[PDB]
Scaffold this active site. Sequence first.
Site, PDB file in Angstrom:
ATOM      1  N   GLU A  31     -19.623 -36.139 -33.453  1.00 19.93           N
ATOM      2  CA  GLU A  31     -20.178 -35.515 -32.257  1.00 19.93           C
ATOM      3  C   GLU A  31     -19.482 -35.936 -30.972  1.00 19.93           C
ATOM      4  O   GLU A  31     -19.323 -35.117 -30.046  1.00 19.93           O
ATOM      5  CB  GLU A  31     -21.706 -35.741 -32.168  1.00 19.93           C
ATOM      6  CG  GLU A  31     -22.495 -34.901 -33.196  1.00 19.93           C
ATOM      7  CD  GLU A  31     -22.471 -35.461 -34.616  1.00 19.93           C
ATOM      8  OE1 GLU A  31     -22.117 -36.660 -34.801  1.00 19.93           O
ATOM      9  OE2 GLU A  31     -22.858 -34.715 -35.540  1.00 19.93           O
ATOM     10  N   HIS A  67     -34.987 -34.583 -36.805  1.00 27.13           N
ATOM     11  CA  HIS A  67     -34.774 -33.131 -36.769  1.00 27.13           C
ATOM     12  C   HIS A  67     -35.922 -32.488 -35.966  1.00 27.13           C
ATOM     13  O   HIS A  67     -36.315 -31.324 -36.174  1.00 27.13           O
ATOM     14  CB  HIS A  67     -34.618 -32.556 -38.177  1.00 27.13           C
ATOM     15  CG  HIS A  67     -33.639 -33.314 -39.022  1.00 27.13           C
ATOM     16  ND1 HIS A  67     -34.009 -34.382 -39.806  1.00 27.13           N
ATOM     17  CD2 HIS A  67     -32.300 -33.184 -39.171  1.00 27.13           C
ATOM     18  CE1 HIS A  67     -32.943 -34.876 -40.411  1.00 27.13           C
ATOM     19  NE2 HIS A  67     -31.893 -34.159 -40.051  1.00 27.13           N
TER      20      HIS A  67
HETATM   21  C1  LIG Z   1     -24.673 -37.742 -36.622  1.00 26.25           C
HETATM   22  C2  LIG Z   1     -25.094 -36.600 -37.601  1.00 26.25           C
HETATM   23  N1  LIG Z   1     -24.529 -35.407 -37.552  1.00 26.25           N
HETATM   24  C3  LIG Z   1     -24.837 -34.412 -38.411  1.00 26.25           C
HETATM   25  C4  LIG Z   1     -25.798 -34.579 -39.406  1.00 26.25           C
HETATM   26  C5  LIG Z   1     -26.124 -33.365 -40.327  1.00 26.25           C
HETATM   27  N2  LIG Z   1     -25.618 -33.629 -41.690  1.00 26.25           N
HETATM   28  C6  LIG Z   1     -26.614 -34.136 -42.647  1.00 26.25           C
HETATM   29  S1  LIG Z   1     -25.637 -34.389 -44.172  1.00 26.25           S
HETATM   30  C7  LIG Z   1     -24.114 -33.779 -43.514  1.00 26.25           C
HETATM   31  C8  LIG Z   1     -22.856 -33.714 -44.337  1.00 26.25           C
HETATM   32  C9  LIG Z   1     -22.526 -35.145 -44.789  1.00 26.25           C
HETATM   33  O1  LIG Z   1     -21.331 -35.133 -45.579  1.00 26.25           O
HETATM   34  P1  LIG Z   1     -20.832 -36.411 -46.350  1.00 26.25           P
HETATM   35  O2  LIG Z   1     -20.851 -37.592 -45.462  1.00 26.25           O
HETATM   36  O3  LIG Z   1     -19.528 -35.958 -46.955  1.00 26.25           O
HETATM   37  O4  LIG Z   1     -21.949 -36.665 -47.473  1.00 26.25           O
HETATM   38  P2  LIG Z   1     -22.382 -35.722 -48.738  1.00 26.25           P
HETATM   39  O5  LIG Z   1     -23.594 -34.852 -48.245  1.00 26.25           O
HETATM   40  O6  LIG Z   1     -21.188 -34.921 -49.220  1.00 26.25           O
HETATM   41  O7  LIG Z   1     -22.894 -36.649 -49.796  1.00 26.25           O
HETATM   42  C10 LIG Z   1     -24.333 -33.414 -42.171  1.00 26.25           C
HETATM   43  C11 LIG Z   1     -23.227 -32.844 -41.246  1.00 26.25           C
HETATM   44  C12 LIG Z   1     -26.446 -35.853 -39.453  1.00 26.25           C
HETATM   45  N3  LIG Z   1     -27.420 -36.123 -40.307  1.00 26.25           N
HETATM   46  N4  LIG Z   1     -26.024 -36.862 -38.578  1.00 26.25           N
HETATM   47 CL   LIG Z   2     -30.447 -36.484 -43.838  1.00 27.80          CL
END
Ligand SMILES: Cc1ncc(C[n+]2csc(CCOP(=O)(O)OP(=O)(O)O)c2C)c(N)n1
Ligand SMILES: [Cl-]
Lengths: 329, 329, 370, 370
Positions: free
Chosen positions: B63, B133
């Site tokens: 972000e 959220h």
């Molecule tokens: C600071 C922040 N930005 C965005 C999100 C929304 N978000 C929840 S899971 C996710 C993807 C995470 O990807 P990764 O770290 O590759 O983990 P995976 O879900 O593939 O296990 C996002 C963007 C969040 N929870 N926190």
């Molecule tokens: Cl989450």
Amino acid sequence: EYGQTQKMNLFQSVTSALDNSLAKDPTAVIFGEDVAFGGVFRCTVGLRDKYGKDRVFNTPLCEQGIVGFGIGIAVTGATAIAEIQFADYIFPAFDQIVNEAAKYRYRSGDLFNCGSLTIRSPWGCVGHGALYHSQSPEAFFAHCPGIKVVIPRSPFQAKGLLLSCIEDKNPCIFFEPKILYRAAAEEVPIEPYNIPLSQAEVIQEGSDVTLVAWGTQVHVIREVASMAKEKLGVSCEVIDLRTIIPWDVDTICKSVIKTGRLLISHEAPLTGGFASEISSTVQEECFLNLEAPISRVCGYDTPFPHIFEPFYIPDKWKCYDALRKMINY
Amino acid sequence: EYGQTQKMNLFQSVTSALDNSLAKDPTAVIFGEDVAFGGVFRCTVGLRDKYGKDRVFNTPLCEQGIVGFGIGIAVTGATAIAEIQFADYIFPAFDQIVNEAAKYRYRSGDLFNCGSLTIRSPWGCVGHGALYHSQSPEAFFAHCPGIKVVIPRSPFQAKGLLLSCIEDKNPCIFFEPKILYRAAAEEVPIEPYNIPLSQAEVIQEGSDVTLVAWGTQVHVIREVASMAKEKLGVSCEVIDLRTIIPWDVDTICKSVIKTGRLLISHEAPLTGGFASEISSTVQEECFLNLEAPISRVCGYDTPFPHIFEPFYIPDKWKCYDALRKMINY
Amino acid sequence: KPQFPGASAEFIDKLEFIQPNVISGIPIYRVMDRQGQIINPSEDPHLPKEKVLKLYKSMTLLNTMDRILYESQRQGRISFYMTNYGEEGTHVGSAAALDNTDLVFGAYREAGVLMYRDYPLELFMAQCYGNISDLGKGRQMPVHYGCKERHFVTISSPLATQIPQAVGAAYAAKRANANRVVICYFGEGAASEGDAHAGFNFAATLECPIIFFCRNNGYAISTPTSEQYRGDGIAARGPGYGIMSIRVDGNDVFAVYNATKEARRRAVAENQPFLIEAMTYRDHPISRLRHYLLSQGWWDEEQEKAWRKQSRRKVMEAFEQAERKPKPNPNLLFSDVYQEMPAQLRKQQESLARHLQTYGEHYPLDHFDK
Amino acid sequence: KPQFPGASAEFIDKLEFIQPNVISGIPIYRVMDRQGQIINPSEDPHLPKEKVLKLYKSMTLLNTMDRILYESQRQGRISFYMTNYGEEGTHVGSAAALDNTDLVFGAYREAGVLMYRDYPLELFMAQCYGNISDLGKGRQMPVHYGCKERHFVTISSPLATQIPQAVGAAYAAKRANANRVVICYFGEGAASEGDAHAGFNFAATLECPIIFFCRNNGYAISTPTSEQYRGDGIAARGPGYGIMSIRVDGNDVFAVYNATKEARRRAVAENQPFLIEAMTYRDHPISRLRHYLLSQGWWDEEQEKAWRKQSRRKVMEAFEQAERKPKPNPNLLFSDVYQEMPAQLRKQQESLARHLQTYGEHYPLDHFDK
Ligand SMILES: Cc1ncc(C[n+]2csc(CCOP(=O)(O)OP(=O)(O)O)c2C)c(N)n1
Ligand SMILES: [Cl-]
Ligand SMILES: Cc1ncc(C[n+]2csc(CCOP(=O)(O)OP(=O)(O)O)c2C)c(N)n1
Ligand SMILES: [Cl-]
Ligand SMILES: [Cl-]
Ligand SMILES: [Cl-]
Ligand SMILES: [K+]
Ligand SMILES: [K+]
Ligand SMILES: [K+]
Ligand SMILES: [K+]
Ligand SMILES: [Mn+2]
Ligand SMILES: [Mn+2]
């Protein structure tokens, strides 16, 4: 009252508090940018030599890391005293403070906490600091349940409040008014002592109007009280708020029920400034007692300027003029 | 009034605004996490296919990077429409918003600016969003001169306000109430139109009390007005603030001079919440007109809970009860 | 001959940019093939039968619980759920290589670590339902688990924030002379956050006994790794921070176990961070382990059937109990904001109590504790 | 044989951690030795005499101005100053390799880029004094320069924030078909900030025509690089993001020029980021260039003396003028907060005007414009 004292300016009183803390708490560590050689404002001089490099140490230049790292130390129960070099640079750590530190105990049902974290940072105007070495960010943090925000007005107050922050079981931000670091000294007890958090201090009793401020601005309102007495025959009750959140609603409301008038002043910009929270609360609680509108004498709603500083700050004349109008309302 | 309309819910009205923007402004780009496939709330569906992958594209998950990157695009004069996936995750970008975007024009003497940046983000409670959220961060941003903060209450309002943000020559944060994304549709003009910033809207005229809110909470106060009329014979003037800063002081004060009472409501926690700024300003300007203390009916001073949400929010009953007491004061 | 404090290096007299090696990146460590066969006998950890059965039953029990709670979510019985499909081997393999008291920081894919550490089914459920048994007092979204007894720090939604926290806890462990290591799990998406750069760098300069465990499953929500980074995944970043790094096959519980066991040994002895990047998909870890068991003569179709039945029963028993429990008293929305409740917060709690006295009919008080 | 979307790599059947190479790191590119002699003729850029004299006079003029403004600061004539000592070659060498219209983002060590771009002495002074001639209207601390005409984005105090901004400006340049590159300067300390990780990663995944120029002088205030990072400086981080990387001798104006010129050429042609890490001290760039000039027969002691005198005179003339100018009207503290002044802000401006009417004797209105 508190044992032997020595004259100390505000930076020395901070060192003394930190020294007392590391002497009595073997878990405690101090870290941040440039803390090892004694800090850019001298607040940590001598501590690494006295307590060891594993206890007083520099981090990489990364404020989000400093605060996240401090939270982790505190999660294990060890006392973490983090430094942020200027309060203006606390913003990169805003997510770690607001989303993480403030919420840590609540969100875990008290299975985990970071109560043993304190973040200390130089704060407020300094004559020529301009946009990024002048800020007073307390209102940003005031809207975040789960942190405490504490600001002293002097060396005696700084050591007692900082010791309380360090020992308090909640993450605390302690803002040190940097224009006072090398200002006048006063007597400060050599041994540790505490000043309670969430307690305002009435420093001068009065009957016509209540004045509220914190940090350096307390000295400005003390002077305003003197000008009002001499020039207007007006009796001012002068109050140092000391803790921004949770704040001492009771002391302020008791004073305003007595005087019927309130003027709040702070260096931070007016809009969304902490004076708005005090004003709206006092109005709710003391409505029938209010003889005049509660006045707020604050910095303007601009960034903090370099060459224009003398015209920006809510100085004794701006406060005095507001007061005069309120007395005449 | 505005040409052909179609029924649109709030996510569709956002897509329509973004579509209109990219059609008429060849510089404009939209970017953030997961925007390319149409976004986690569908707000960007179809836009990459229609306008191209160089104009609607995903960033890495960072972000602080999203906002810094948007500021840089805007520094060259190109329109940058950044998405932050939930408002709760805007905090890592706080330093880029507050220290950089808000101060960019001032600190350069207008040699550089990032006026063509808009940051859009889902906002407010959603029934089960819990701590991360559900948040409504507008009061944190309200204390930062140099940014605008805008929050719509409906699809018609969202498209007109978002188009204004995108075209406004100042960095804007546009908060989209996510509980309204798929709520009821209403008619929304297909072609572009603007709703002015820093202008509140009186949606229902009344004579006994002024009610102020924004976002979804406008609908709550509209219902409260109805309950007050039916149950108490009380005439409420209902106002949607729409822009948090710079806010429409004049419209709110005119209403309170007429009614003599004010109740402000918002989902965000009470302490340091934006209701404190409205309350303290109205008290200063309308003091002699106030029949009762200005009441604030806000979220509690806690993080936003999962299972307890129904008990946390300042719902129509909490607002109605506050109103009843104020009418009886 | 160069005299610069910032780096230790020779001069070069010709201009040459350093090119990243992405087409042939850091190789993927493997112990068993897709048929469950050991590839290189000197790498076999030769775990005893009881431990290997525990790895298998932990993974499959997690998978059973995933199936049921995912269906519960589809019906709106719980408000949210995240499955562990494809994650089972990285979590159970790594958890098995840790000490019971090693502190775990994670994200929402780490339930298998708790399952390995014998976290009760009743408490996984209690958290998802936000019921009276939840030690988190129903305050967070589902799948935001935490256990002080099992040294598993409560999950929070903001990605990557736990990374520099994990480093601080490891620094404190070092000082305590713990002989404890901290492990910190995060996805390849989360590794893009500024806090990841903070944690990796602090762990190296402050010499912390921490394992960074990155789960690379190729996607962060809709975003493929081609839009997430352009270097050779996350493992190639470690050496740039001075961090010893390895990449493993996340579908191979033994490769995960071996790498975690060796990282733990060296992290705790040397006070230095290790980075493991486990490659998965978002050829399954459970299948591959089942094939292995079936070779040793340690499992067969009858045992598979009985365990499938027993695990479904245990999960169903916990599920039914969890749904029938009340939610916590609404008073609990006010406690633990600070350790001690500020007078002004108590005032808000009293105001809710008064409100509910008068308007309580309008609140779903039926299934909240009183 | 591995099928993982997150990386392109073979399997390996033995456990082996990847070790960082820090003792023999990325070598330091050099063109001339400490005696100003070209080491490898094929690397000589053979810059013409007029350009090389311009590099030398830009560096020395900056040094002359540093000396005078640093003394001014010691006397409290200006409130703050940052010198460029040791930086002169990295800034003038790199600026010379750029196009005039290439956009520059920096920090407080980048005055030499402006000096190369013929920024008037009067305007450097105007900013430090906050006088009526400052286009920044006296709002920022000294040494926070900016010039829209010379494509030098105004400096701000928070370190590293300009890094992801520079990437965004480069993305926009790409779209505009600019045939323009952006350069972004930052110190090795600033590279520890989260925003550095953000900028490097976005530049690679979004394919931006940007040069990252890191100045590694071994210290960030009191902090030596041993406490700042543990990898092989900043250059070794580039390849982990997929960024073509090089390290140069920052005391060698030709090595800096060559690396910047080639980075610019490839960044603009390929739409890919380049990282240059220039090693300096906090054997000087000016001395080394002087030795070179003295070999070509392009300078001598008489010219050195006349230029020393002329440059001191020009700086003194600007200094005296700057000190005598008034400061801007205090009204200017209210404009440009937004493009248009909000009614409530105008109200605050009117309130200051009224205040000064009554209490103006108490304000230092003497030297502010009216
Ligand atoms: C600071 C922040 N930005 C965005 C999100 C929304 N978000 C929840 S899971 C996710 C993807 C995470 O990807 P990764 O770290 O590759 O983990 P995976 O879900 O593939 O296990 C996002 C963007 C969040 N929870 N926190
Ligand atoms: Cl989450
Ligand atoms: C976010 C932030 N934190 C801290 C500072 C205080 N600070 C000003 S310069 C400096 C050291 C910078 O070091 P480096 O990036 O190596 O640049 P150098 O001064 O060596 O040229 C620090 C910590 C700041 N300006 N911004
Ligand atoms: Cl994460
Ligand atoms: Cl600075
Ligand atoms: Cl920088
Ligand atoms: K504390
Ligand atoms: K805008
Ligand atoms: K987290
Ligand atoms: K900067
Ligand atoms: Mn992923
Ligand atoms: Mn440096």
